[PDB]
Design a protein around this ligand. Structure first.
Ligand SMILES: CCCCCCCC/C=C/CCCCCCCC(=O)O[C@@H](COC(=O)CCCCCCCCCCCCCCC)COP(=O)([O-])OCC[N+](C)(C)C
Ligand SMILES: CCCCCCCC/C=C/CCCCCCCC(=O)O[C@@H](COC(=O)CCCCCCCCCCCCCCC)COP(=O)([O-])OCC[N+](C)(C)C
Ligand SMILES: CCCCCCCC/C=C\CCCCCCCC(=O)O[C@@H](COC(=O)CCCCCCCCCCCCCCC)COP(=O)([O-])OCC[N+](C)(C)C
Ligand SMILES: CCCCCCCC/C=C\CCCCCCCC(=O)O[C@@H](COC(=O)CCCCCCCCCCCCCCC)COP(=O)([O-])OCC[N+](C)(C)C
Ligand SMILES: CCCCCCCC/C=C\CCCCCCCC(=O)O[C@@H](COC(=O)CCCCCCCCCCCCCCC)COP(=O)([O-])OCC[N+](C)(C)C
Ligand SMILES: CCCCCCCC/C=C\CCCCCCCC(=O)O[C@@H](COC(=O)CCCCCCCCCCCCCCC)COP(=O)([O-])OCC[N+](C)(C)C
Ligand SMILES: O=P(O)(O)O[C@H]1[C@H](OP(=O)(O)O)[C@@H](OP(=O)(O)O)[C@H](OP(=O)(O)O)[C@@H](OP(=O)(O)O)[C@H]1OP(=O)(O)O
Ligand SMILES: O=P(O)(O)O[C@H]1[C@H](OP(=O)(O)O)[C@@H](OP(=O)(O)O)[C@H](OP(=O)(O)O)[C@@H](OP(=O)(O)O)[C@H]1OP(=O)(O)O
Ligand SMILES: CC(C)CCC[C@@H](C)[C@H]1CC[C@H]2[C@@H]3CC=C4C[C@@H](O)CC[C@]4(C)[C@H]3CC[C@]12C
Ligand SMILES: CC(C)CCC[C@@H](C)[C@H]1CC[C@H]2[C@@H]3CC=C4C[C@@H](O)CC[C@]4(C)[C@H]3CC[C@]12C
Lengths: 616, 616
């Protein structure tokens, strides 16, 4: 297990088909050696005529692979040649503009131009480094496979073939890449950094990338520590709940308060697994989300954060069950928990994942002001997640109402004991249901405005608009049934029609457009698409089935929450179906990102394009 | 941080002095660059005269280092040349003997030989590999330091100096090592493995060694998980003990039963830190203990075992406090705990560290039959550890006596209920105190017999014999005072004299012989020895002080045990001082192994010699 794993781990995914096929050659050689077509006694033709036809096919395949590698390298080299000239031309103009001006507003745009140029040069350097690594890996693969050939068949043809063709091949000989690498860093050192090579090389240097670097031991230790503490606290919580809770005490406000924290911690834990799967399968989420290719979080850090927050959630709930303090009222523990969560998110000090938190804060500001910002992939993705995390918004609204009105502060234990805050009487609940759908609807309309293409942005707008009709008719039915009016039946039929319409119209879009399945050119992969990234095929069928089932369950949860069913039945339904929506989104993320990535392949794009701004 | 750390981490402990001094050159260069002796009004001559005297000293130092490297390489090459001829001569004879014999007991006097030859060849291969790595690292160091020189002073002298001298140097040019490596594996493949190259290369191949390999993530995760569970269980145990234990209930048998398990877990946990320190500081415990240089436990596995056993200890004690089952008697939990520990040690299946457990089982068999086996370092070391772990033997003996007579089986919860047992009256306490001292005394006598050297083996024999006198006089005093006799005072004076004699005679041996401090050639390191491995010097003084204090405490614990002091006072005294003896041994291990290792340096030893067994 030396080079097959190494080659599999060190390949740039977008060019996966352009590398040498090490596994194919090995298999061919093994099969041939295994099936030695020997003959009775000794036959010259049997043992030497077979070893005069396999080698020719082997060398024909080798020539084909070498030609493919040469063509790809030449094309990428030409592209780099053109890009360097473009960047050089762009860099001349800023200098030309300033010096003349010298011998506020323009200053800030000039600073922005400097930053944009410094980012574009870094991306160019990264592309050059990737091409160099491509050359090195391909040569190593040829050498090792030819040595294995000469070992297996006990002949010296491969050693001479390597010298005759591979060492003469242009991709091995051409030396323009090193000159480009030297020129780029010289220009960055002189023109931008004012002669300081150390700062420029700190910016330009590339560490190991992809799935080729393990996280530090002190992170794995902390992940395990937090997981163990969380497990033991859960066991103790269940035992205390079974053996200490009274029959008369009402637990429903407590459940409605802690549901949101449970959902958040679960969400983070599942997102960690999503990141692990994306990293392992070869899906480049760093390029899609436009993160820094040299500094970004792994799955260990997300596991670390989820466990740390779970410990605090468990401690707060456990202190609410018991009473470790004889003077502090029992209704300040959820307040402390959520205040600490908020302060952890918005900590201004440069500690505890400050870059990640600031990136997320900027993203959240961009999402909640939808019409006035250009829409990227991250904004779409985050608004989709918020579409499934609306039970948290309901829990927050209910907590605010309960603490404002229905809570008796006079009682020593008033956190656990009417009905005003858990119904849609004033209509706030209907609005808080429709906020995230409204954000996605506005984003789709803005995208149509920018692109000026009717399909498929207006179709998304309608898909998100159906929720408004469904919720409106549910609310009308519920408010007419309780007051005893004669129009209950018409609203019932309208609600069921719009329920089925919404469920079908979201499910079809999920299966056909978001995931890109059921393609005409499926071929052997029945009901799937032509190219698939994840290894097993049972994953796709299981995902289709669970999505079909869980799309019907999700719509009923939203309809039921607005005083539809009897309060007792409704509470048990919402609590159980809430985690299943987060599970459905967790499953959806895999294939949405895979379908997005498969577009990058076939265009062979490995680095994000940066467009420097022009002051003049 | 590229090459200084790399060179520090890949150096061979025994030959550390023989490598290039990268840190010295860097410091010299930096100092010179920093204090540039410029003049006022830019004097050209003055500065060019400074840059005509530093370089000459630099190149003189370079020549000295190159000569040292050349001499060391030549000497090691000659040694390898001689060793190969010796092994080849030994290998001819076995073959010569068998073939003639051919054309049970006889099989035994033949089977072991083959194994010994296969081990000797592996050690020879390892030595050759180490020499090759030495060459590579030294050349890389020269190249990088000369490049840094040419960078700092902005001159091209270093580039030409590297070509003129280093590339011509014999240690770089000589190619006999590769021929030796090829010949060794060819001989192993043909003569011993009967032409199967794969099996021979599996035996001969060397993975990364020393402190250059990281433990797998699934081991660190388990270490952290067990540590977290252990912490939470300890907190719960303390809370339950504070809030549930009754005043009338007697806890002393329970403490005396669980003390031994606590001590064992603490010993394993501290042993892990000892291993970590030995690995980091450069002390080669693998060569001293004669373990396999390619497969051996790290500190993570010891942490892993200690945490797993601590979880079971906590669960058993917690179940003893509570009653989670209403039919199982409360006195079977310690039985289950210790039975599981014993079964884990002696599991015959090839699972859960089978090689380590079998090695330890063979070692324990060798220790407990002292006179009939040759004494190595591992036997001495393990008997010393057992000398400090005698409270466990007392706990086992007391548990055996308590269950047999004192416990009342009929009662539902008789585990924690008068005092017929646990008395230094039977005499089954003085003997169990003196068993480990007896084992070490016998080992020292056997050593003297084998080596035929009076010093220092008979001195150790006397040092371990003093314990017999101290314990005997303590027992005589205690048995005469309780029955009211007139000879109490003479035994009191004898006991105090032998107490002070034993304490002084063990402390002096610890400080002067085991650790090798207070040496005549201390020089700058006052009260220490000339060469020291661990970085800080405060460690040695703190260790001396704590050893002086804790040697006086240890002697009183052994004397107090045999019915001297009032039972209530004695119990609190033996529980507090038991962990401190394990801490004292934990501190002692560091410097004992360091003093043993410093002998290997100066002889330049590695790859321990295997004496092949001759069938003859
Ligand atoms: C009920 C009361 C609750 C009270 C509120 C409690 C809130 C407490 C919450 C605390 C959460 C703290 C988590 C920190 C994560 C930060 C983002 C991140 O990880 O980016 C990572 C990318 O990784 C990915 O793109 C995949 C996951 C992205 C995170 C998306 C949001 C996750 C949380 C959704 C939360 C929804 C919240 C609203 C829910 C309704 C790393 O990016 P980077 O490597 O740093 O980028 C490199 C370049 N750069 C650094 C310059 C950018
Ligand atoms: C109450 C009833 C409880 C009964 C006991 C139940 C609990 C005890 C359970 C024990 C579980 C096993 C733990 C490890 C033991 C295996 C040996 C080992 O670790 O060697 C390691 C080295 O490490 C060292 O050289 C330092 C010594 C380690 C421990 C040695 C004895 C002290 C621990 C025990 C003291 C016992 C005290 C007994 C009580 C006084 C690794 O060696 P290796 O890599 O395998 O070697 C490679 C080549 N070879 C494999 C071919 C050799
Ligand atoms: C009564 C006693 C009960 C015993 C129960 C024992 C429970 C077991 C719990 C074990 C947890 C102990 C620390 C685990 C080590 C972390 C792993 C690690 O990364 O090693 C690091 C150093 O390793 C060290 O620094 C060891 C220092 C141990 C300090 C112990 C603190 C408590 C006193 C090296 O890491 P890296 O390779 O640089 O990355
Ligand atoms: C406790 C506080 C927990 C903080 C949140 C989870 C734990 C944690 O963040 O570890 C923190 C230390 O944290 C500690 O060392 C103390 C634990 C470490 O987090 P960080 O060092 O800020 O992470 C930097 C990640 N980066 C190096 C890629 C930029
Ligand atoms: C409601 C829920 C709240 C959650 C809060 C508690 C959070 C608990 C979070 C983490 C605890 C569990 C995750 C273990 C992390 C292993 C680390 C690791 O070594 O990665 C390994 C793979 O990583 C995986 O295989 C991820 C698979 C996760 C399986 C989850 C099992 C429980 C369902 C790869 O390791 P390596 O590089 O081969 O070495
Ligand atoms: C129950 C028994 C637990 C054993 C002690 C815990 C640690 C442990 O043994 O992990 C075991 C798995 O064990 C598991 O994964 C389940 C826990 C793994 O231990 P191991 O795989 O036997 O270690 C081999 C070490 N060696 C590869 C160097 C030879
Ligand atoms: O010498 P290396 O550079 O380390 O090459 C080794 C080695 O080849 P050699 O034996 O000729 O030295 C292995 O051969 P074995 O000793 O194990 O028989 C070989 O195994 P194969 O016979 O299957 O080629 C293994 O290959 P792998 O790990 O892929 O199984 C391969 O490593 P490389 O792939 O890096 O050449
Ligand atoms: O090119 P490399 O082989 O990676 O050598 C680098 C590099 O040298 P260059 O700049 O000439 O490429 C660093 O230089 P900087 O860019 O950071 O200025 C240098 O730093 P120094 O100036 O201190 O030599 C660093 O050395 P180090 O990590 O020891 O500080 C050194 O790495 P190497 O030691 O492996 O040569
Ligand atoms: C009806 C129910 C049982 C359907 C269950 C579907 C779930 C279990 C399936 C659907 C998609 C699947 C995932 C698809 C992709 C990956 C990435 C791969 O590298 C690890 C397995 C993993 C993470 C799969 C785990 C199992 C999975 C989540
Ligand atoms: C009187 C009391 C406080 C004395 C305490 C002495 C203890 C704390 C001292 C004496 C010997 C010391 C150890 C000596 C060697 C090492 C190896 C080094 O790589 C890590 C520190 C470590 C592990 C030291 C830890 C602290 C230490 C254990």
């Amino acid at each position: 297990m030396k080079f097959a794993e190494h080659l599999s781990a060190h390949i740039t995914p977008e060019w996966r088909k352009q590398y040498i096929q090490y596994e194919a050659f090995k298999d061919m050689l093994y099969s041939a050696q295994d099936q030695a077509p020997s003959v009775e006694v000794t036959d010259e033709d049997t043992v030497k005529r077979y070893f005069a036809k396999f080698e020719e096919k082997f060398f024909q395949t080798c020539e084909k692979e070498l030609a493919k590698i040469n063509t790809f390298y030449s094309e990428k080299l030409a592209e780099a040649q053109r890009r360097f000239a473009t960047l050089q031309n762009e860099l001349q103009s800023s200098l030309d503009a300033q010096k003349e001006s010298t011998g506020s507003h323009e200053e800030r745009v000039q600073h922005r131009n400097i930053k944009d140029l410094k980012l574009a040069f870094s991306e160019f350097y990264l592309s050059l480094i990737l091409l160099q690594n491509y050359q090195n890996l391909n040569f190593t693969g040829f050498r090792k496979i030819l040595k294995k050939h000469d070992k297996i068949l006990e002949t010296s043809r491969g050693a001479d073939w390597r010298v005759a063709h591979v060492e003469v091949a242009p991709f091995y000989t051409c030396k323009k890449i090193n000159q480009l690498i030297s020129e780029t860093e010289a220009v960055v050192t002189n023109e931008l950094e004012d002669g300081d090579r150390q700062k420029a090389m700190k910016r330009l240097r590339v560490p190991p990338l992809g799935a080729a670097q393990p996280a530090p031991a002190w992170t794995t230790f902390r992940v395990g520590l937090f997981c163990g503490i969380f497990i033991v606290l859960n066991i103790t919580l269940v035992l205390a709940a079974v053996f200490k809770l009274e029959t008369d005490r009402s637990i429903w406000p407590l459940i409605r308060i802690y549901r949101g924290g449970f959902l958040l911690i679960e969400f983070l834990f599942l997102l960690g697994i999503n990141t692990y799967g994306w990293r392992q399968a070869g899906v480049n989420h760093v390029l899609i989300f436009e993160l820094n290719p040299r500094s970004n979080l792994s799955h260990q850090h997300l596991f670390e954060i989820a466990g740390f927050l779970g410990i605090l959630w468990c401690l707060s709930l456990l202190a609410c069950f018991f009473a470790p303090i004889s003077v502090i009222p029992t209704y300040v523990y959820p307040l402390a928990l959520y205040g600490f969560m908020v302060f952890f998110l918005i900590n201004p000090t440069k500690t505890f994942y400050y870059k990640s938190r600031f990136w997320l804060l900027k993203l959240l500001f961009r999402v909640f002001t939808a019409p006035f910002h250009k829409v990227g992939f991250a904004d779409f993705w985050l608004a989709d997640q918020l579409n499934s995390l609306s039970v948290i918004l309901m829990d927050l609204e209910y907590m605010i109402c309960f603490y404002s009105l229905e809570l008796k502060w006079d009682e020593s234990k008033g956190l656990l004991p009417s009905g005003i805050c858990h119904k849609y009487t004033y209509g706030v609940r209907a609005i808080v249901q429709c906020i995230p759908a409204w954000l996605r609807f506005i984003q789709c309309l803005r995208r149509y405005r920018d692109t000026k293409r009717a399909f498929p942005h207006l179709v998304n707008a309608g898909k998100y608009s159906t929720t408004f009709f469904m919720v409106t008719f549910a609310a009308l039915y519920s408010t007419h049934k309780e007051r005893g009016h004669s129009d209950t039946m018409v609203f019932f039929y309208l609600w069921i029609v719009f329920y089925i319409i919404s469920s079908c119209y979201t499910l079809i879009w999920d299966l056909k457009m978001d995931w890109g399945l059921f393609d005409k050119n499926a071929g052997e992969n029945t009901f799937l698409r032509e190219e698939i990234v994840y290894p097993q095929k049972a994953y796709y069928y299981c995902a289709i089935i669970e999505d079909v089932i869980l799309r019907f369950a999700w719509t009923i949860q939203i309809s039921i929450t607005s005083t539809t069913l009897l309060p007792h039945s409704g509470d048990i339904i919402a609590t159980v179906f809430a985690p299943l929506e987060v599970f459905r989104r967790f499953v959806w993320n895999f294939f949405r990102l895979e379908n997005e990535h498969l577009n990058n392949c076939g265009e062979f794009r490995a680095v994000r394009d940066i467009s420097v701004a022009p002051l003049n």
